[PDB]
């Protein structure tokens, strides 16, 4: 029941108010934080999160975390 | 307007895909705070104790907003 177990279909079906935190976590957990003094969205997220959504629409059966491959 | 992560109600939180609860709670607890983690972004022991308290808070107060946990 971890985020790494979430499918792309589950991701695109999330309450919209959950999609940004979930996408952020997938993109950033277990990576170096490069975003500055405070935790915030940054331009990388502006460009990547829409790509995650599109990737998951095209590949709903794949796990969300396969975006990183 | 009413569609942002900051606007999530406690009822919405307890109704989430269970796989989303930890990332949503983490973001609520950490967004806009000073980053005090190590080299990489990981859960810490404060998250271990606080995230269950977030779940309990929203179960007890479904009418309140998630982000009011911080108050």
Swiss-Prot record, chain B:
Sorted alphabetically, the Gene Ontology BP terms of this entry are:
cellular stress response to acidic pH; response to acidic pH
Q: What is its main location?
A: periplasm
Q: What happens when the gene is disrupted?
A: Mutants display increased sensitivity to acid stress at pH 2 and pH 3.
Q: Spell out the molecular function terms from Gene Ontology.
A: unfolded protein binding
Q: Which domain of life is it from?
A: Bacteria
Name the coiled-coil region(s). none
Chain positions found as N6-acetyllysine: 64
Q: Which compartment or compartments is the protein found in?
A: Periplasm
What are the entry keywords?
Acetylation, Chaperone, Periplasm, Signal
Q: What does this protein do?
A: Required for optimal acid stress protection, which is important for survival of enteric bacteria in the acidic environment of the host stomach. Exhibits a chaperone-like activity at acidic pH by preventing the aggregation of many different periplasmic proteins.
Q: Subunit info?
A: Homodimer at neutral pH. Dissociates into monomers at acidic pH.
Extra facts: In vitro, HdeA is more efficient than HdeB at pH 2 and HdeB is more efficient than HdeA at pH 3. In vivo, both are required for optimal protection against acid stress at either pH 3 or pH 2.
The protein depicted here goes by the name Acid stress chaperone HdeB
Q: Which gene encodes it?
A: hdeB
